[PDB]
Amino acid sequence: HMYNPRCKDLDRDYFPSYHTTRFQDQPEPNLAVLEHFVRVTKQHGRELTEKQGITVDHLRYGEGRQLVDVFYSEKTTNQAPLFVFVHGGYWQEMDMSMSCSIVGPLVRRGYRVAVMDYNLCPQVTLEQLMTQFTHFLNWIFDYTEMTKVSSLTFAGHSAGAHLLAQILMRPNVITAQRSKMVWALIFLCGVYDLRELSNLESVNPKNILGLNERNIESVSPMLWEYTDVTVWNSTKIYVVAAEHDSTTFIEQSRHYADVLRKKGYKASFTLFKGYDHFDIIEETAIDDSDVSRFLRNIEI
Ligand code: NA
């Protein structure tokens, strides 16, 4: 138990749902929280286009679930900045319909918002999902370039934070110019070192992540040898943990922030009071929420 010197149970430290303070009168609060998350995020999604006057374009960067929905207000110019959101779900669950809580307040602040979906393990190995995600980063920059827009922010949650980390190490796709377009990278409650969970059946049953010893460094942002850091020093990096996450998740974020800082990235660690791993996303649908205020404050 790296990341939790005082851990008793390594598995439960890898399921953030056991770590909330919500639904503590529920016999299984971990299932309550998941149920609630599914429900409210689907509701946020419908409210975006049925109530909030927001428009969506349904696009694709690949076959099947490799989709990108772009949300915008027609009352706003087409040359607005683009905010990109990458959803979580341990590379094996979640979809677009539960991923759009973040959209509404951003559109009201004058962003266009791209919410993407991806193929899940074991339809791909994690390595292959990562190659596909590289196709997505190429797509999003081609899309922004075509639109002749040259300001972006990316944010990923959980597994999505893990995925987003490769943006720092794909220079055959991410040119110096592409890098210079990025205002900020936001890593919400991600995981960055997969050596412990790779060996657990509860997280990686029957090895559906398709992991092993040759590729464990490559799927672990924590362990990479970062190079050409200088092209990112126009980009602010925010590594964020929720206070009510597992100590393992919290420390994974703290340590990843340390790794980046030590490499010379403009990175910071934030422990966000009052949130667990889930409501930190749920509350992004509320303009006045603490998390919303945080995202807004990044702009300054
Ligand atoms: Na711009």
Report d(CA 138, CA 44) in Å as an integer. 28
Strand partners, 154: 84, 185
How many A from CA of 181 to the centre of ligand 1? 8
Report d(CA 99, CA 137) in Å as an integer. 18
How many A from CA of 180 to the centre of ligand 1? 11
Element (H, E) at 259: helix 247-263
In one letter, which amino acid is 169?
Answer: M
How many A from CA of 107 to the centre of ligand 1? 15
**Resolution in angstrom units:** 1.6
Please identify every residue whose CB atom is under 5 Å from ligand 1, which is an ion: 149-151
Contact 7, 1 (CB under 8 A): yes
Report d(CA 195, CA 5) in Å as an integer. 16
Give the closest residue to 150 by CA, choosing from 242, 79, 69: 79
Domains and CATH numbers, the chain: 1-300 (3.40.50.1820)
Report d(CA 139, CA 134) in Å as an integer. 9
DSSP 185-227: EEEES-----TTGGG-TTTSGGGTT---TTTTTTT-GGG----
How many A from CA of 203 to the centre of ligand 1? 40
